[PDB]
Symmetry: C2
């Protein structure tokens, strides 16, 4: 649909493929000028170490920022997510 919709999808699809990611829980993406600022929360194994989760988050950043054009900023954070949790990604576009 919209360019914002397209960018969201590409961000999600790129992140979902990164080893260690158990789904994207949340993506906030809004326009800052003609660029896009994005904050996302990924799911990870609760038994990963903090250091392992940091690795996965950085790997998502690299995958997204390498591929996708005009990202003003991308913050990836991680929370525990259980196997069995089939919740789809949630989107928002407002300031916080």
């Amino acid at each position: 649909g919209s360019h914002m919709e397209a960018v969201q999808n590409r961000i999600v699809e790129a992140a979902e493929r990164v080893p260690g990611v158990r789904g994207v829980i949340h993506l906030r993406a809004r326009y800052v000028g003609q660029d896009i600022a994005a904050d996302m929360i990924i799911g990870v194994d609760p038994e990963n170490t903090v250091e392992q989760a940091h690795e996965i988050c950085e790997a998502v950043q690299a995958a997204v920022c390498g591929k996708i054009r005009r990202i003003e900023s991308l913050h990836v954070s991680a929370e525990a997510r259980e196997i069995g949790d089939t919740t789809k990604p949630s989107f928002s576009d407002q300031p916080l």
Copy 2:
């Protein structure tokens, strides 16, 4: 400054909670006569994600219990090495992009 005083008390309260290796970042602003705060703590890199979440919740409880009129407190965690003696930052700025965290 009451905002300065509240910041200091938030830092000292959080640094005492088991599992916390210092406060890395505190953002605090007024919402009416209350205070909204976002905080990043340091934790052991070898803690599990779940353990770090526990410590974060414990910091929330310790800060909100002690300090009056906190509208909201979000606490997030980042790996931090022993030896890192960097003092807390109260900058209002976004984090760097090699700086990623565990939240909620």
